[PDB]
Paper text:
We report in this work the [name]/I pilus structure at 4.3 Å resolution from electron cryomicroscopy (cryo-EM) data, and report details of the donor strand complementation. After rigid-body fitting of the subunit’s structure determined by X-ray crystallography into the cryo-EM helical reconstruction, we used RosettaCM to refine the filament structure of CfaB based upon the cryo-EM map. [name]/I pili are assembled using the NTE of subunit n fitted into the groove created by a ‘missing β-strand’ in the previously added subunit, n − 1. Calculated from our [name]/I model using CocoMaps software the buried surface area between subunits n and n + 3 is 1087 Å2, whereas the buried surface area between n and n + 1 is 485 Å2, and between n and n + 2 is 453 Å2. Our findings suggest that quaternary structural stability for [name]/I pili is due mainly to the stacking interface formed by every n to n + 3 contact, as demonstrated by this contact having the largest buried surface area, 1087 Å2. In the current structure, Pro13 has a better fit in a trans conformation, in contrast to the expectation that a transition from trans to cis would produce the rotation required for the conformational change from a linear to a helical structure. While at our current resolution, an unambiguous fit of Pro13 into the EM map is not possible, bending of the backbone structure between Pro13 and Ala14 appears to provide the rotation necessary for assembly of the helical filament.
To attach to intestinal cells ETEC express colonization factors, among them [name]/I, which are the most prevalent factors and are the archetypical representative of class 5 pili. The bioassembly of [name]/I pili is initiated by the attachment of the chaperone/minor pilin (CfaA/CfaE) heterodimer to the usher protein CfaC at the outer membrane assembly site followed by cyclic incorporation of the major pilin, CfaB. Adhesion pili subunits are assembled into helical polymers after being chaperoned across the periplasm, transported through an usher protein that resides in the outer membrane, and pilins are then sequentially added to the growing pilus filament. The helical quaternary structure of [name]/I can be unwound under tensile force and it has been shown that this mechanical property helps bacteria to withstand shear forces from fluid motion.
Author numbering:
A (entry chain I), B (entry chain K), C (entry chain E), D (entry chain M), E (entry chain G), F (entry chain C), ...: 1 to 146
Write the structure that this text describes.
Amino acid sequence: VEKNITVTASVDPAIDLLQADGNALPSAVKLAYSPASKTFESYRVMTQVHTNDATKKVIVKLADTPQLTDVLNSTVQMPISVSWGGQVLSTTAKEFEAAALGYSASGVNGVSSSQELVISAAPKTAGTAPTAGNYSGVVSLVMTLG
Amino acid sequence: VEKNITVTASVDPAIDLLQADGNALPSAVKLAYSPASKTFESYRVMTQVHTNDATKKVIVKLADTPQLTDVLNSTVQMPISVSWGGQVLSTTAKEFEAAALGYSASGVNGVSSSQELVISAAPKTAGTAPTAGNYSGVVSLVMTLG
Amino acid sequence: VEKNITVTASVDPAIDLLQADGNALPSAVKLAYSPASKTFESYRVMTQVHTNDATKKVIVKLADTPQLTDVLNSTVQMPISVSWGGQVLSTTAKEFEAAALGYSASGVNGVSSSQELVISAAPKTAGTAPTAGNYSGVVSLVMTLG
Amino acid sequence: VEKNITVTASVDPAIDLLQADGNALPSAVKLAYSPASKTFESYRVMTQVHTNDATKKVIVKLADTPQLTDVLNSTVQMPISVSWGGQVLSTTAKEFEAAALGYSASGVNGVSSSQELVISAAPKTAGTAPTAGNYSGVVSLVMTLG
Amino acid sequence: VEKNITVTASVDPAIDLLQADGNALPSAVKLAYSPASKTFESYRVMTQVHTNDATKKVIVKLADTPQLTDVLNSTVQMPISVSWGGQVLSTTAKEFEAAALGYSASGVNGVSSSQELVISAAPKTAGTAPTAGNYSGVVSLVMTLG
Amino acid sequence: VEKNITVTASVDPAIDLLQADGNALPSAVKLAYSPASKTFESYRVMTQVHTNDATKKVIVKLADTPQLTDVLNSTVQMPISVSWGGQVLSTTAKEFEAAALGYSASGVNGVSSSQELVISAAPKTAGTAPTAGNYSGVVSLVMTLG
Amino acid sequence: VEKNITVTASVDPAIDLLQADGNALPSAVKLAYSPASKTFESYRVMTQVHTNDATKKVIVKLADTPQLTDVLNSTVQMPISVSWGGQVLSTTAKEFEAAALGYSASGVNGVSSSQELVISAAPKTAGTAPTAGNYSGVVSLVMTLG
Amino acid sequence: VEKNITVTASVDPAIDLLQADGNALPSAVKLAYSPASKTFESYRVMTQVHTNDATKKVIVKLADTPQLTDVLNSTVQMPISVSWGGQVLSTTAKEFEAAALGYSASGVNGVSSSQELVISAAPKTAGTAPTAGNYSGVVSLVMTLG
Amino acid sequence: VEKNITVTASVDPAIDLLQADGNALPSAVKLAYSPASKTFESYRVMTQVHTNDATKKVIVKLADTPQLTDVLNSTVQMPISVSWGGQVLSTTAKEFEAAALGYSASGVNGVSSSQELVISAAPKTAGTAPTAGNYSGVVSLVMTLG
Amino acid sequence: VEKNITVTASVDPAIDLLQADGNALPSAVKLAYSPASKTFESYRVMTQVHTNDATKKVIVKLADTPQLTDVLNSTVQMPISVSWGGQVLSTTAKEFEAAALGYSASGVNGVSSSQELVISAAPKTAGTAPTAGNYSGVVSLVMTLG
Amino acid sequence: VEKNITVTASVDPAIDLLQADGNALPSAVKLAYSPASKTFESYRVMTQVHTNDATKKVIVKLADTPQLTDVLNSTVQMPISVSWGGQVLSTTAKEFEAAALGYSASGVNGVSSSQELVISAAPKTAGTAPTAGNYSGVVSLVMTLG
Amino acid sequence: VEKNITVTASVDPAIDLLQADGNALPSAVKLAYSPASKTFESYRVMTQVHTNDATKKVIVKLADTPQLTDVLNSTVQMPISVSWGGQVLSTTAKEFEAAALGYSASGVNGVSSSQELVISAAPKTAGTAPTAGNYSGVVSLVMTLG
Amino acid sequence: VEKNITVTASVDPAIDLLQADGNALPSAVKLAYSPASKTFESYRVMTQVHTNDATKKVIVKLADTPQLTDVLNSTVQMPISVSWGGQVLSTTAKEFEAAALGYSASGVNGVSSSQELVISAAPKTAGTAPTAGNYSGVVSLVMTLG
């Protein structure tokens, strides 16, 4: 009754971000939208960086296009509003103090403190509800260790 | 340590239903079953419609098959009993008074009053417990603004 | 570093069926089989017809042989059980009411309501598990606009 | 504004255990740990069996591994201490008298009396606090009707 | 608007393993890695064997190479740590008692009890984080009925 | 039982583009078309350039005819809309900053950051669905290192 | 409208290797090359030997020249790295245990277990990317039944 | 640098069969053979007749010898098993209903529906694997419009 | 067992066209014809010019008669539609920019970029299917270096 | 309508070489030439010796003049580069081990394994493209059984 | 520069056989011989009779000596094995049904269907390879219209 | 063993026509005849004029009698249809532009481009097959340099 | 109807040269001439010496006048260029090794290997085309056995 399965992984020492509970982060999410408020639902997560070096500061930015579109119209576009660690992130570089994270906090060396993550996104135009339709797009959270 | 994520959304002005607390509704649920009562658990939610027009009445119905089955026998079937807003819903059209909802109620224009939602479901046959097994099926809650 | 790629497409106005989320449908699928139940896994999808004419009724049937076989024995055969839109489909013609689909539903004109799709298949014989082996076959979902 | 939802269920006549109030039981729980006492928090519930046969005695055991671990180290392990109905449960079979439960008690035939449930768990080693970290594991409460 | 689809299946009486909920098992998975712990994420599933003979004991082993590599360097290798049913599995034969599984348990004859599945994997070397890179490899879970 | 196989390859140092996961890119793709939107499906991929020189900027253009046709009428033509790296590509030369790609990002020197790829294509004429038929054509993605 | 077609085949009892799914194996393949790693892509397949005698051990080797070249320079050469069944193959004879393959495994007598196949190939020289160009060559997988 | 090329074609109005995608059909094919099943591989294609008259029924048969042989022994012979359009074909005349093909189906007038094609072939003798060797032979698919 | 073989070649410096993969081009081809579309099959190739001088522009034309006929009636004639490099070719002279070809592209000096080749051909008369019959004719692709 | 035909043949026991598929070898071939590489196209074939004695070793050489010329200038000459069976051949005698060929391989006694054949040829002078012109010459592959 | 040429022809109404493609048949052929099989190569052609009368049946036989010899020993002889139209031919008269040929088939009146032609030939003696040498002989295919 | 041989030649500067490959032209040819089409086979060659003066235009005509006859009846006659260089030739003078031939084309000065040659011939009478018999006659291709 | 015929022959043991196929050699030949190259056509044959003594070496030369002339002017003369067996021949004596010919080669004792024969001839003067005219002359190939 042999039943095979695929396995994969990705290592990248000077560890990535992870879920605060000690699991992986999502690979997807759904957001709502209320044109009575003209906002998506502000998706939120608490997360805990790990590392392999407790001093080096962590660098963050994004790829060019944190924006959605129509699943069957590539022309429609709407940006995305991202923020983590207590403030906004950009396509340009940010950098966070290692001391401001508690690597020797509750758990074990490398485990930072729990950090607020936020994924919002809004219409590009104010006072304007976008077109009725299923929309989609990807955030490619650039991040590294300085 | 770049870590990308998918995002999606769906707009449809003249807003859908939403959770009363001001969040999204469930995408899934589990129900029990007691053949000592021969009923599932009557799942319940309080919800709050939004809109983009405070006068137009809201229309409701369902798709053809609010019924479950066996996860490995498509032949087994059992209907589902749905009701919202104080009464039952059908595959045929209902319609609710806008004035009977309080769009200028506690919060802000468009926010209706909190509405009782109910998802029950029962054996198709009376005095008959169905077969032992994991069962499944989807409700496609048709709804729109008249 | 020039790297070329093939592209294709198929148009057929009075649109085909599509995935409910606003994407393409599968080109393949795998089904299980439990001879403890003597059924395949009842594969299921929610889908949304489009069109170029909101009145005309949609016609459906199948090609002659919705049946599987052995990948290395063409003699073995087992039929397939298909159903969509709330009922079974045949090699003979069905036809669905346009009004019973909600082309002016949640999204935009032409977008029907979400429709249940089902792909099951069973042994031709009752109380009979077929031969151990990888099996295969194709469904050619005839469909058009009346 | 059509918004679909998943539904599921599981039947198994000769009913499972249920919450004493007449609801479902938890699907999860959190426990603390005090190495000043070197114990988790003794989680507790009152519950009420149902059935479809008031005479047959109810059998209980567990799957092999009522033990936790580290969420990112499968090697760490610590057992779990379970007890229900007034005494301990095992990976081996127990069995409870039907008469000792009051199926004709307060409510209606089948409704047993309220039964104490207990979920504790401790370090495998005495005088030893385990490693700092989020831990996890599942109990698979085998149970049936004799 | 004819739209064809492929279908396949695989039978093998004396059934394979399946998802505990009554669905298929995954065909793929992703694991993380924290060199602060120097472990992948311990992936886990609860599963339920089926059969066509309730007495015969189930045999298990693996193919030669439960190990990963680099997607663009076949030389890199790291083993994989598998365990199911309460203990480890090997490239050599194991065998499980039928009585220790509950084929007459909650559901119906053949349906075993829910069994813990675990897929971990670690660096071959201790105190050594592997090279930064996307890695891959397959487990071919040999299994049969004794 | 000797069974021979062909092998080929193509080298071109100052590496081509590759799949972000660390595999090859597609050699083909299928696109849909909805004349309710009058768009193909916006096909998308995340990709990661490699190189042999981390400073030199990467040049891009296309061959003359990013357009489809009819498989049995060479006269029918419809252009193609391509874009990569955050913007559109042409039959004329583009050029991308090396610093804006993260060659020292998550993985190893040369591995750029993950880049959005997009393959759309539309009718040449607005408000015009093309003829019913299977269509085809090739994109020859000119690209090199400046 | 008579339209003729060629057919061929090759028998060789004591069967050759075949695709694990129950189909033929490839007649060709493409490999990449990254001089950032200085490796081709490690091509991989899972396969299942058949036979006409379940005891006899299977012998393997290769023809003299598992190496590529330039399509327009026969002088350029680079070897190929092959391995199957859990280890490397040579121009010299190997031999595999019949018992170590599971001919009475999941399917039917003769069907071995699924075996890992690997086709890699590298520059003959270390720290040396070969010349820019389309390359080619054939592997003639000698194999027989001992 | 003048480089000449041959061109040919064949017209025969009341069109021949063609590939379903809108291309030509194969001029050759290879089949396997497993004497563990004692069958070739059941080769399969989906195809779409065209015509110049939508009413007339299409006639089919074969030439005398749908059989293979040895490439260096004309005495060896083995028949071939052909079937198309949902059933078997012969050296004698068949005939298919025009209405049962959908000439006004998805595409344009004349384009029939997609039709299953099958090319199998077996040993003439049961329980008998033929001689080891490369074999060959041609099918001359007689067909016309009634 | 001496077995002799003929060899030939043709040099012409300032190289001819060649197959893009790095092989020779075809010496022949077959085209279909569908009088439901009244077109042959649009045959296509991607190709790569070479040279011995990277500046000089390449000149193209054709011989007088890019037309087919009947294999046993020289009177029947039908022209041929040729196009390469992004546009049509004639019996008169064309000329292509060297800079518009990428001789320093992916490979090595002289290797142009991949160029689309097209060989179509149609009935001389519109709304007219030619006579049933095998047809033939040659294209003599005049070409040189300006 | 009597139509006569010539037939010939050549026997020479201790068989010659033959095509690997089980057919005759070519009597002619065309080679290209790229003075951007200054090489002909490396023509290649896989072949299978036969014999009438499985032990005796096979001897090979060539006649004096494996070289081309001009079809209208006998003075022009360019040598030819031949190699078979994994290495080069000469006007002098080579000899191959019978055991190194697999006469009891896939097929039947006498049928050797598939052997790589290569026909290249180059300008006699380095850095020198020969004269523009059609060239020709014959290889007389001396070969026998030792 | 006057250059004269010979021309000839042969008419014989109630036409001879011809090549199926619409060309002449061969005037010569070469056959191999493998005394490992002790057979020549089974030469084969597909052909299409023409006529001037669609009813009359076609008669066939041969001249006395379908046999080869030595080019320098007239005493050596070996017969020839001919077959056409689905069966063997003789020095005695055969005759074929006109209706069994499709004169109103794909092309035009008179054009029969494509017919298998076969030219084999073998040693006169079994288990006997003939003498080493170039051999020759002619078949004079008697044929006419009954 | 002295063995003598005749040699001849013919010079005529301002060269004659020659075979395009760089060889002599035929001295004879055979044509078929199908009274189902009432045409001979349209014999065809590609050829390349040479010269000793690249400007002068080439003149062409024929001798009086491009017609066949019976080999044993000089009274029977049938004309011949000749055409070269893209059009018909006569017993009267034609003349071709030197510039329209490419003397500086692919090869070397004097070598014209490849020119289509055609030798057809038909019954003198329409709807009339000539007498059964071997026929013959000569074309004397007058040609010179103007 | 008595019809007589002449016969002749010539014996000369220690055999002459013969055609490689096993026939006689030509008694005549025609050569072309291109004053664009100022060469005749290089006539060529492959041939096979026989003998009556396998050791003795074969001697070759020519008679005095391997030269042509005018058929009606004996004064015009042009030499001839002969070469055989891999090199030139003279009016003086050459001699070839018996061992370098393979008398025990493919066929039977005495049959040498196939030897290249060449008959060229050129103007006596360089840069000089001879007079327009039919020319002639004989080569008397002296040859014997040393």
